[PDB]
Design a protein around this nucleic acid. Sequence first.
DNA 1: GCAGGCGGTCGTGAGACCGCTCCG
DNA 2: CGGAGCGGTCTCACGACCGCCTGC
Lengths: 161, 161
Amino acid sequence: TLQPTEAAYIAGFLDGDGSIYARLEPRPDYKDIKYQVRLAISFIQRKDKFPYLQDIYDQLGKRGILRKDRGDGIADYRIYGSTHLSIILPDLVPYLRIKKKQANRILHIINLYPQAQKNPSKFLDLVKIVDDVQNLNKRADELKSTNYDRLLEEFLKAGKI
Amino acid sequence: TLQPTEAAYIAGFLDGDGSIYARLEPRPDYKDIKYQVRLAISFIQRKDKFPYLQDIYDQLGKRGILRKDRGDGIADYRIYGSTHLSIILPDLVPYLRIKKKQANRILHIINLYPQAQKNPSKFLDLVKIVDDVQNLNKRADELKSTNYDRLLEEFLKAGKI
DNA sequence: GCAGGCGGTCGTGAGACCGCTCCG
DNA sequence: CGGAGCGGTCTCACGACCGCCTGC
Ligand SMILES: [Ca+2]
Ligand SMILES: [Ca+2]
Ligand SMILES: [Ca+2]
């Protein structure tokens, strides 16, 4: 497993060249709610320093997927899923500074995901944190995400409340 | 002073949003050798996250100078001088990965600076590491720095060897 | 149906510096 | 002097995502 100063480093580095986000991805094939909430952390870097993502990956139990080239010389390492994340984040949260919040919102989403799954009213609360999160990843002067307001609208238009 | 996982974090973060460089700055006012070698580490970031540089600064004994805005909304924190650096780097070196080398070259320059000061032959060795350093901070496909070769040339042209 | 493996991509936010002004 | 405070700037290297193909 992970040592304090390796967790601290990864956290330090994540605050630098990394990213903690949530997404609301449309689903045509889904049931009632045609949207899967997607969660991840990532590390971006110039492919020549790839062995350094490499390193990190291996330090994080080989969860997530490395990508020696995103097609533009820039390499990366993306960790999807509440599974990987609920193991990883707690180790990193105590050392995160800039993206610490984001990491807790994600954990928070993770607590409420099972009850919100088949429950349109609760899936909306969940989608709000998804908004708040992507907001955290913004300039205070950029357009503030609005998945909560466009999903509700649609849930009413479809008589799900 | 500095704790392991705070040093680890700073190192992690430096490897991300920071920079370790050496420069050869021209001096019209100098004596024989009209060039001062300049050494530093820095942390760059969007000014809204400034309190986070802040943090780091204070964790690094308030050495170096913060800059809430470089004129382009981007804030920073620059630490010049062998003085600050010979105290700081050793705490960070054990946790540095990507810029670890650079940190040791700097330390290395720091060992040889006093003898190379008034000694054109030795000042050249020193200026080579200065080259190697800025090379480390490059794409393997970029033009490889050449302070060693343009300073020598000039030292001969001026009969200093 | 349930999601994660992937491929992609605009828009900045960093990096790695150069030159001056200043100060014991 | 001998260097460090400070302003300033090109060129990318990131970030924070979208949309689709893949697995069972
Ligand atoms: Ca950053
Ligand atoms: Ca960065
Ligand atoms: Ca970086």
